[PDB]
From a paper:
Tetrahymena thermophila, a classic ciliate model organism, has been shown to possess tubular mitochondrial cristae and highly divergent electron transport chain involving four transmembrane protein complexes (I–IV). The energetically favorable oxidation of NADH or succinate by the electron transport chain (ETC) complexes I-IV (CI-CIV) first establishes a cross-membrane electrochemical gradient of protons, or the proton motive force (pmf), which is then utilized by the complex V (CV) to drive the synthesis of ATP1. Here we report cryo-EM structures of its ~8 MDa megacomplex IV2 + (I + III2 + II), as well as a ~ 10.6 MDa megacomplex (IV2 + I + III2 + II)2 at lower resolution. Our findings demonstrate the structural divergence of T. thermophila ETC megacomplex in adaptation to the tubular morphology of its mitochondrial cristae.
Megacomplex (IV2 + I + III2 + II)2 defines the relative position between neighbouring half rings and maintains the proximity between CIV2 and CIII2 cytochrome c binding sites. We were also able to isolate a minor particle set corresponding to Tt-MC (IV2 + I + III2 + II)2 in a separate cryo-EM dataset using digitonin-solubilization, focused refinement of which resulted in 4.18 and 6.77 Å for its two Tt-SC IV2 + I + III2 + II parts. Although the resolution prevents building an atomic model, it is clear that the two supercomplexes belong to neighboring megacomplex half rings. At the megacomplex-megacomplex interface, Tt-SC I + III2 contact Tt-CIV2 from the adjacent megacomplex, while the two Tt-CIIs face each other directly. Although the relative position between Tt-CI and Tt-CIV2 is divergent in Tt-MC IV2 + (I + III2 + II), subunit NDUTT4 at Tt-CI’s MA toe does contact Tt-CIV2 from the neighboring megacomplex via subunit COXMC2, as revealed by Tt-MC (IV2 + I + III2 + II)2 structure. Meanwhile, the three outward-facing COXMC2 TMHs are kept in positions where they can easily contact Tt-CI’s NDUB2 and NDUTT4 of the neighboring Tt-MC IV2 + (I + III2 + II), thereby creating an additional interaction site across the two megacomplexes in Tt-MC (IV2 + I + III2 + II)2 apart from dimerization of Tt-CII’s IMS domain. In the IMM, ~160 residues on the NT of Tt-CI core subunit ND5a, previously un-resolved in individual Tt-SC I + III2, is now resolved in Tt-MC (IV2 + I + III2 + II)2 from the digitonin dataset and fits into the concave surface formed by COXTT21 and COXTT8. In Tt-MC (IV2 + I + III2 + II), a direct distance of 97 Å is measured between the two cyt c redox sites across neighboring megacomplexes, while within a single Tt-MC IV2 + (I + III2 + II)2 the distance increases to 126 and 170 Å. Although no such charged surface patch has been identified for Tt-MC IV2 + (I + III2 + II)2 and Tt-MC (IV2 + I + III2 + II), the nearest distance (~97 Å) between cyt c reduction and oxidation sites in Tt-MC (IV2 + I + III2 + II)2 is comparable to that in a mammal (85 Å), yeast (61 Å), and plant (70 Å).
Author numbering:
A (entry chain 77): 63 to 124
B (entry chain 08): 21 to 251
C (entry chain 52): 4 to 100
D (entry chain 62): 256 to 316
E (entry chain 76): 101 to 149
F (entry chain 91): 860 to 990
G (entry chain 81): 460 to 516
H (entry chain 67): 111 to 220
The structure:
């Protein structure tokens, strides 16, 4: 437990500002980010038109 | 070197008493080592004190100067021991060099952290915090207490009390971490706020600022005598 | 509402405190008497200075008072140590978060 | 201002480039001949002269 | 010759140069925080190498 | 080298203290934008909504009249894509940070170098440069 | 790097033999001293050139 | 001492090179990797990093740790398997890193 | 084992530091309030308000703090009788005289301060209207007393730790 | 100003309040560890209390009331647990 | 240090070289310490300069591009404020078509 | 072990030592398993810890070599062969998973 | 946290900030006292750092020339050549100031660790070229109709030997590539496979890596 | 020099003593190694100060000559004892080289870009491969608080 | 690292080019990029903020900006 | 840089030669009090923030060299001159003059040095509001600016 460390995994942005709405959003266990940190740097294989259609047909977690 | 039972007599946990004893033992053992080293010198170089009278004639003529010189030697030995134990003596936090007192790293780090991280509560514990502590009788055991919500006894809503019960006991959020308690404390100590004095919500965590093993500061242990490897 | 001290420890402490007060009064009187007796005895047969006589008298009076107040003070100290240790442990276990 | 101590329009890092032109204060400043330094030298010389004269007067007795 | 200059000439020269020439630095720089530091003399002239 | 080769360890040398005016706000905005992961690269600028409004309309950043537009991959001509609603949704999560950064930049812009700055010569020495 | 081990022995032997003796200064002695002094610098230059980084530079 | 140094070169540089000579149908890549790793991982070439602050200054350690970690980027390097940890703070004093396993990127030390 | 000379001892036997929970095991409710107020104000006045701290410090000075110092000063001045105690026309030993005077005076000052404290502390603490008013205003609890005791012990440890290098402190 | 002696300042909260001159001068307080010395001090206090009651027979001064639990506790525990090992 | 550490110095002497330079060695050691002080001071100064240079290089690597981006953003924000003022002017021109002209 | 968290191989620990038993003496899979075991410190005893460790291992493997989105999610066999060199992102992910699985306490 | 849909993007949120009282964010920021001097220095540094171009007045446009020796800049200023127009750091003017790093390495067919013991990649280039030549000979003729060399680029498929060819080009130099290409042209005109004459393994020592049941050798485990 | 940023890094003047420029890390390390080697030889030279004076003052024929009765030498550990000084210098040189070399050697496969340098008769040729162009677009950017983004 | 020093130039021709770019950018972005031909180069506008800082004061001056807007409308007319 | 340090030292010498004024004298007294309390007599290791500790240690080293060491050197020179005169008088080596004149010279030149680099030392305290030392320095600087009617940084 003493030596357990993050090692740079899922390094999401930690807003220090008090008026940050995302903070409250980041508090929500049901909050969904735009993409997973494990896949944030993965090569995209989808087509441009398919990606545009999927992004247009997206719903907010809240 | 602190009569560890006496340290627990004042406000000190068993581990906190151990840390305070470690610091006091370091200081006292350094001073005692210096003083006792001074003792054998006078038991050995007493003739050397008399022989060094040809270079300094007044000593052979003024007897009190001999006692003054003996006291000076004792003080020099004590100060040498103190500097060997109670000085800064910063060094590299290396596993192959820690443990052996080539530096005073452990004691220096503990003292510096204690000086930097200690401040008074600057306020009185709220009655709700007193009540929460009063309701914390034996709730820290290994088995989680099955908190039963009785509407005739707990009132409110069954879920609301269950969430409140979790926040008070199961979640572990401190009474100093309660929103209502924080608001009440803000309302109360306004006079101190009239002087701009910050309010300390949590008491000074002794276990979070001192460590005889030194793991808190993350100083690697001696390579030859530690099975565990830090960091 | 607040924490309440243990019952048996409280009773023992009360008894020890009463005994200690009585022994303190008795020892003060005994020490005054011993100081007077020491002053007289030193002025009787001792060929020494008045400073030495007074120092001996004060030291002997303090020693007599301590001898009269040994058992009571020791018992009070033991009771206080046990009570304070128990109370401190309980309070630390209570306020620990 | 006479006591500006900045005779060249350059910062401490000297971000300006040579030739570094003089400043308005440096316009009036005379190197080593200012009133303050001249008065300091005058005071040193007066102190030395007063000491020597006192010593001579004591010897003249 | 053998002892004095062989252990003081280079250091004295470096001290005098840094004191009077500021390590031979060009004056028109932007900020010391983001500029290369012109170190003083490091190859000892009195040394054979 | 050796265990003691330089014979002097300059532990006094501290990390150079950064003195940018609104670096904290700018970095917070950048971190929020990175968490959002907006495909358009121009969004990194705080004034991006006022810089290229076509990004919020069609993504038509530049005129391709003379240079032909021949996209090959998804990561090609990324400046030529409108902001997707989901991305726009993620764009709302950083609005407060963007506004704070803009306010800080505006306040810095309002600053001037007046004559009262008598220590204009002694700036770097004040600005943690005498290391 | 290990080759310099024999040279140091030779320099030490020369220096030691030059001491605790009945010196009769001849023209030959000055030339031998000059040769030793010249050999002193050359060994240091060769040892410095033995460093891989310095040689590459 | 020289012969021991030579024997190490003899046992780890030439004779393995004389073992495999022609393209092989079965595990040619494995045999070549074994042969190369038998020679590319001599400790005299890698053992420096264990005590690096002796040759790397305080700020120099921070400046080089970024390149050093980036130096062993491609995992396909058996000799890199022998090099010491490039994720260590300066032994005397480290100016940048507070916690070793607290980084903002899985491949960037800061 | 002579830490009584190697460690600070003046702060121990004064300012009501001898009080502890065991004492509160026998005191009454109003007595508990008064004792808690006095001990908290003495050891850790930070937890109290500034105006109340000022008033309590003024009361403590008017009662024992200045009075114990005055009594110790009187005892030291009594001990200061005949500063040239060992003096002669042939030679007056300034070293021995100053040394004896210094050895006598501090002991007398300590004795006087201890006597004044042990005599007036019960009366001042027990029968102070301002102290009673402060106890009514505060009404510290047992948890407050425990926290204050811990803080006072930490402050005592800090005082010795602060004056650890009084000769040369480059800081490294 | 006494108010200046009440302000909470970190530098004030971390200032060495004891000079080297206090090392020797306050050294006499350590004798309290001695049982005989503590007893002598207590005897002096008791005699002073008797004289104080005798003088408190005069108006303006109240003697040591034997019904004060606080006073009794203070008198009986002023040196209850003195220990130079602590602090 | 020297002949003291050995139990038969004569033997020790021969065992090295059969030559004696002991007094030279002692005087040389004293003079060597007395001279070694100064080069130590100079090397300390030089090492401090080198460490400062390394720190400056690291900081420029870390803060340079960030400062440049911040300056660009400041210029863009000033331009945005000016553009907002010009847009207010254009709105006035829309409300005052030719009156402003 | 430049990417590992231990100064020496003997300082690697039993988990890292198990890495030596995992692959042959001629594969960087030893270093990969050492990195995986380092990623698993203080998370093996927790289920959510194991999940987050799998995510971290996937992230590290993706950072090492460029692979398509979700490609590592199509590994036919998570089992590893002793002769598996770190040639592919799938191999890297498998080695990291094995290193996480080998971390006790 | 008051509304249930807090954090959901407002509908039709133009994200415009026209006429916003910045005093609200004053409590959200802290400004150094030396802000004026810091801003002036930052502006000067931006003017003197990124501006690697010179505004020619004759064309009334910023122009640039390739980097040259400082003396050539100073002592040979009047003879400027190769002057071009300023294109800008980005087509849209975005800022490119950022610390640079290393992108993830591409998958490799020929492992560099096979012959990494040599500082010169001669044998490595040879082995990579042999592998690429085998792949090309396998997939030579179908490039024009079944690879990227097809006409309908909508159906273009990356050549199956693209990775090997790129790895070989990285391994070998220009002259080595030319010599290997000539040898490959000869071998392709021959259309002779290496296996069409392979006999070396018949005289090779037996190895545990050459057991009969190859699949039985790899003991897979997790 | 591109603009006001004077890219000229050497700028060495005539009759220079040391290296051309200390702008390179290798150059800084070499200078530090040389200075340190010059620093820690003191005692050695000290003996040289004492040996010369004694020989030139109490070893001549007219000043304290010595009758050397030395039939044979009987040294056994002299060479190994004196070899510590060469061993220390060798160790220092090897450590410095291994420190310098480890940062500029055996790191080819982990390269951000690639360029071919072909030296021809009286000329040099710099060849840039096509893939490098793609690598130009694939450079990660450390934006924000050490956050790496790939476009 | 070693960057020299050169203050803002404020050259008449460069200032004219920057002012033309700024006016075009204002006219275009005032329509929120909903114009006929995107002729503005934002990076160039950045130079306007640093190469003609004196003229920037006119941009920071309200009455001066109003007069400039009137002149620009007249020119566009 | 080194040029900046040389310029600062020369400007400080020139200013000390020009004069110390009255408002400037009061500001110097306040700055000296602040430096003595929060820096010179306060151990830099006690500060909460490690960065604050580093900056305070840098300032403390500057004070130890620029003020303490310089004053010690001046006092030592004065002591050497006085001891030379005394030894010339008695034709023998005395012992008291060295320490006595060293202490006197350290006491004397201690303020004068503190009088010259009063501003420069203050310039090493501008850590920022993020540090408690920074906040206190900002308050002190605001008071000095109000006194002097000039905007410092
Ligand atoms: C007779 C001539 C001679 C001698 C004796 C030597 C002796 C040595 N040489 Fe060399 N060398 C050459 C002639 C010689 N050399 C020539 C002609 C070349 C170039 C070939 C060409 O053109 O390429 C060359 C090239 C050469 C190079 C490479 C240059 C190049 O790249 O080509 C190197 C580097 O490793 C080297 C090293 C050495 C070493 C380490 C010794 C060692 O033997 C000497 C080191 C011994 C000592 C160190 C002992 C001295 C004793 C001391 C105690 C010194 C310490 C004293 C102080 C510090 C005061 N020599």
């Amino acid at each position: 437990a003493l030596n357990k460390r993050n090692w740079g995994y899922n390094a999401h942005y930690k807003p220090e500002l008090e008026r940050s709405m995302k903070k409250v959003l980041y508090a929500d266990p049901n909050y969904k980010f735009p993409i997973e940190w494990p896949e944030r740097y993965m090569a995209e294989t989808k087509t441009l038109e398919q990606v545009m259609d999927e992004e247009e047909n997206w719903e907010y977690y809240k | 070197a602190a009569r560890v039972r006496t340290l627990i007599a004042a406000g000190f946990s068993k581990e906190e008493a151990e840390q305070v004893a470690w610091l006091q033992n370091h200081q006292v053992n350094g001073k005692i080592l210096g003083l006792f080293t001074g003792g054998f010198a006078l038991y050995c170089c007493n003739n050397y004190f008399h022989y060094f009278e040809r270079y300094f004639p007044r000593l052979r003529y003024q007897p009190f100067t001999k006692f003054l010189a003996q006291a000076a030697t004792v003080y020099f030995f004590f100060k040498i021991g103190d500097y060997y134990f109670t000085s800064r003596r910063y060094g590299s936090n290396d596993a192959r060099m820690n443990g052996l007192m080539y530096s005073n790293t452990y004691y220096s780090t503990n003292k510096e952290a204690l000086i930097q991280n200690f401040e008074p509560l600057n306020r009185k514990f709220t009655e709700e915090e007193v009540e929460q502590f009063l309701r914390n009788e034996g709730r820290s055991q290994e088995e989680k207490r099955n908190w039963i919500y009785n509407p005739h006894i707990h009132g409110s809503t069954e879920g609301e009390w269950k969430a409140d019960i979790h926040e008070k006991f199961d979640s572990g959020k401190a009474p100093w971490e309660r929103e209502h308690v924080k608001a009440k404390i803000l309302e109360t100590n306004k006079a101190k706020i009239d002087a701009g004095e910050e309010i300390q919500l949590k008491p000074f965590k002794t276990l979070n600022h001192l460590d005889k093993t030194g793991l808190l500061h993350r100083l690697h242990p001696f390579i030859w005598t530690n099975n565990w490897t830090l960091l | 509402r607040d924490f309440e001290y243990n019952n048996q420890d409280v009773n023992q402490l009360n008894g020890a405190f009463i005994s200690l007060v009585e022994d303190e009064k008795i020892g003060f009187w005994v020490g005054v008497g011993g100081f007077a007796y020491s002053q007289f005895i030193m002025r009787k047969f001792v060929k020494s200075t008045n400073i030495f006589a007074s120092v001996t008298s004060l030291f002997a009076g303090a020693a007599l008072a301590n001898l009269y107040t040994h058992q009571s003070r020791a018992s009070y100290a033991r009771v206080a140590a046990r009570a304070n240790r128990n109370a401190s442990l309980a309070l630390n276990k209570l306020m620990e978060y | 201002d006479e006591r500006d101590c900045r005779h060249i329009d350059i910062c401490s890092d000297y971000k300006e480039d040579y030739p570094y032109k003089f400043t308005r204060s440096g316009v009036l400043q005379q190197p080593g001949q200012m009133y303050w330094d001249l008065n300091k030298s005058a005071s040193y010389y007066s102190l030395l002269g007063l000491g020597c004269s006192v010593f001579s007067a004591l010897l003249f007795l | 010759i053998v002892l004095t200059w062989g252990w003081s000439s280079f250091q004295i020269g470096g001290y005098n140069y840094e004191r009077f020439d500021d390590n031979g630095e060009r004056r028109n720089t932007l900020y010391w925080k983001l500029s290369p530091v012109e170190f003083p003399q490091s190859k000892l002239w009195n040394r054979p190498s | 080298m050796a265990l003691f080769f330089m014979a002097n360890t300059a532990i006094s040398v501290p990390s150079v203290l950064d003195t940018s005016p609104c670096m904290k706000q700018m970095l917070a905005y950048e971190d929020c934008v990175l968490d959002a992961n907006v495909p358009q690269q121009e969004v990194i600028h705080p004034q991006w909504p006022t810089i290229w409004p076509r990004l919020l309309t069609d993504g038509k950043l530049l005129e391709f009249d003379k240079v032909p537009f021949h996209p090959e991959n998804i990561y090609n001509y990324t400046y030529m894509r409108p902001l997707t609603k989901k991305n726009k949704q993620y764009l709302y999560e950083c609005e407060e940070e963007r506004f704070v950064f803009k306010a800080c930049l505006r306040k810095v812009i309002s600053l001037k170098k007046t004559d009262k700055h008598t220590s204009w010569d002694t700036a770097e020495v004040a600005n943690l440069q005498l290391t | 790097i290990m080759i310099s081990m024999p040279a140091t022995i030779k320099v030490v032997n020369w220096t030691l033999s030059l001491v605790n003796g009945a010196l009769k200064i001849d023209l030959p002695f000055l030339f031998s001293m000059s040769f030793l002094l010249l050999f002193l610098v050359a060994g240091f230059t060769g040892m410095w050139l033995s460093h891989v980084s310095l040689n590459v530079s | 001492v020289c012969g021991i140094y030579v024997i190490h070169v003899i046992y780890n540089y030439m004779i393995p090179y004389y073992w495999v000579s022609t393209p092989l149908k079965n595990d040619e890549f494995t045999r070549l990797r074994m042969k190369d790793y038998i020679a590319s991982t001599v400790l005299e070439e890698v053992y420096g990093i264990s005590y690096a602050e002796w040759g790397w200054l305080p700020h120099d350690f921070a400046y080089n740790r970024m390149r050093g970690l980036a130096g062993y980027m491609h995992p396909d390097d058996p000799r890199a398997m022998c090099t010491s940890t490039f994720h260590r703070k300066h032994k005397y004093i480290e100016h940048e890193v507070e916690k070793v396993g607290d980084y903002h990127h899985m491949t960037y030390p800061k | 084992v002579f830490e009584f000379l190697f460690y600070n001892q003046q702060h121990k036997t004064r300012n009501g530091y001898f009080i502890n929970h065991d004492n509160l095991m026998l005191a009454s409710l109003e007595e508990r309030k008064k004792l808690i107020f006095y001990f908290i104000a003495n050891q850790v006045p930070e937890k109290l308000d500034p105006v109340d701290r000022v008033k309590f410090n003024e009361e403590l000075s008017d009662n024992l703090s200045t009075k114990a110092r005055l009594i110790g000063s009187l005892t030291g001045l009594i001990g200061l009788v005949g500063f040239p105690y060992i003096s002669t026309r042939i030679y007056s030993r300034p070293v021995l005289n100053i040394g004896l005077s210094l050895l006598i005076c501090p002991f007398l000052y300590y004795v006087g301060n201890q006597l004044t404290y042990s005599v007036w502390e019960p009366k001042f603490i027990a029968n102070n209207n301002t102290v009673c008013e402060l106890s009514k205003k505060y009404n510290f609890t047992v948890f407050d007393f425990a926290q204050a005791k811990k803080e006072a012990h930490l402050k005592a440890l800090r005082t010795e730790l602060v004056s650890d290098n009084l000769l040369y402190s480059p800081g490294i | 100003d006494p108010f200046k002696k009440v302000e909470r300042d970190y530098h004030n909260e971390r200032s060495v309040h004891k000079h080297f001159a206090s090392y020797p001068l306050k050294f006499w307080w350590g004798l309290n560890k001695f049982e005989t010395i503590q007893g002598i001090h207590s005897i002096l206090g008791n005699a002073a209390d008797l004289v104080v009651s005798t003088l408190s027979f005069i108006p303006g001064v109240q003697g040591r009331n034997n019904a004060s639990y606080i006073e009794n506790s203070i008198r009986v525990t002023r040196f209850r647990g003195f220990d130079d090992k602590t602090q | 240090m020297g002949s003291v550490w050995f139990r038969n110095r004569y033997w020790w002497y021969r065992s090295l070289y059969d030559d004696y330079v002991a007094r030279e060695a002692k005087l040389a050691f004293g003079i060597a310490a007395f001279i070694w002080l100064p080069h130590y001071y100079w090397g300390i100064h030089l090492n401090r300069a080198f460490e400062v240079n390394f720190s400056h290089r690291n900081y420029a690597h870390e803060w340079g591009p960030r400062r440049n981006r911040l300056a660009h953003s400041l210029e863009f924000e000033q331009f945005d404020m000016i553009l907002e003022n010009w847009q207010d002017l254009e709105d006035e021109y829309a409300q005052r078509g030719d009156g402003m002209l | 072990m430049a990417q590992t968290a231990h100064q020496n191989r003997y300082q690697g620990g039993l988990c890292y030592a198990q890495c030596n038993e995992l692959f042959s003496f001629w594969n960087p899979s030893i270093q990969q398993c050492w990195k995986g075991c380092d990623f698993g410190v203080g998370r093996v005893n927790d289920p959510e810890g194991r999940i987050e460790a799998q995510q971290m291992c996937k992230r590290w493997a993706a950072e090492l070599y460029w692979t398509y989105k979700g490609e590592l999610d199509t590994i036919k066999d998570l089992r590893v062969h002793a002769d598996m060199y770190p040639t592919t992102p799938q191999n890297v992910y498998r080695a990291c998973l094995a290193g996480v699985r080998r971390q006790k306490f | 946290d008051l509304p249930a849909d807090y954090g959901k993007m407002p509908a039709g949120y133009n994200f415009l900030t026209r006429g916003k009282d910045w005093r609200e964010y004053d409590k959200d920021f802290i400004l150094r006292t030396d802000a004026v001097w810091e801003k002036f220095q930052l502006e000067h540094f931006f003017r003197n750092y990124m501006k690697c171009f010179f505004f020619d007045h004759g064309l009334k446009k910023y122009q640039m020339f390739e980097p040259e020796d400082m003396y050539t800049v100073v002592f040979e200023g009047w003879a400027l050549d190769d002057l071009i127009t300023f294109p800008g750091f980005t087509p849209t003017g975005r800022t490119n100031s950022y610390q640079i790093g290393l992108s993830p390495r591409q998958r490799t067919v020929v492992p560099t660790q096979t012959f990494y013991q040599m500082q010169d990649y001669y044998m490595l280039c040879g082995l990579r070229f042999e592998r690429w030549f085998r792949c090309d000979l396998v997939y030579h003729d179908q490039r024009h109709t079944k690879f990227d060399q097809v006409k309908n680029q909508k159906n273009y498929k990356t050549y199956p030997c693209y990775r090997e060819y790129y790895e070989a080009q990285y391994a070998c130099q220009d002259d080595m590539f030319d010599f290997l290409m000539e040898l490959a042209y000869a071998r392709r005109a021959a259309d002779n496979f290496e296996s069409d004459f392979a006999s070396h393994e018949l005289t090779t020592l037996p190895t545990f890596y050459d057991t009969p049941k190859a699949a039985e050798r790899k003991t897979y485990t997790y | 020099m591109w603009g006001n940023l004077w890219t000229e890094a050497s700028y060495q003047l005539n009759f220079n003593i040391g290296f051309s420029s200390l702008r390179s890390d290798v150059l800084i390390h070499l200078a530090q190694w040389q200075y340190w080697w010059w620093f820690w030889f003191a005692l050695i030279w000290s003996f040289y100060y004492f040996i010369i004076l004694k020989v030139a003052r109490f070893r001549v024929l007219k000043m304290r000559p010595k009758i050397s009765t030395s039939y044979r030498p009987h040294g056994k550990w002299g060479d190994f004892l004196a070899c510590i000084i060469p061993l220390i210098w060798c160790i220092n040189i090897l450590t410095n080289s291994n420190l310098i070399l480890r940062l500029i050697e055996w790191q080819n496969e982990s390269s951000l870009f690639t360029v071919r340098v072909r030296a021809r008769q009286w000329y040099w040729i710099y060849k840039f491969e096509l893939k490098n162009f793609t690598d130009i677009l694939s450079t990660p950017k450390n934006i924000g608080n050490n956050r790496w983004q790939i476009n | 690292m070693e960057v020299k020093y050169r203050g803002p130039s404020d050259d008449k021709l460069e200032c004219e080019f920057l002012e033309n770019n700024l006016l075009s950018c204002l006219r275009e972005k005032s329509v929120q990029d909903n114009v006929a031909k995107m002729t503005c180069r934002p990076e160039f506008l950045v130079w306007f903020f640093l190469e003609c800082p004196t003229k920037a004061a006119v941009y920071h001056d309200p009455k001066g900006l109003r007069n400039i807007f009137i002149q620009d409308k007249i020119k566009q007319k | 840089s080194c040029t900046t340090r040389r310029f600062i030292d020369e400007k400080e010498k020139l200013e000390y030669s020009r004069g110390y004024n009255q408002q400037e004298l009061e500001a110097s007294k306040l700055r000296k009090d602040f430096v003595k309390k929060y820096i010179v007599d306060f151990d830099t290791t006690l500060y909460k923030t490690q960065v604050e500790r580093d900056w305070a240690y840098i300032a403390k080293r500057e004070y130890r060299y620029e003020v303490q060491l310089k004053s010690i050197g001046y006092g030592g020179a004065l002591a050497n001159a006085v001891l030379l005169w005394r030894i010339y008088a008695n034709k023998k080596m005395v012992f008291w003059p060295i320490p006595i004149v060293g202490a006197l010279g350290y006491l004397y030149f201690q303020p004068v040095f503190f009088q010259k680099s009063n501003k420069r030392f203050f310039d090493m305290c501008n850590v920022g509001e993020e540090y408690y030392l920074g906040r206190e320095r900002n308050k002190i600087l605001r008071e000095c600016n109000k006194i002097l009617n000039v905007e410092d940084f």
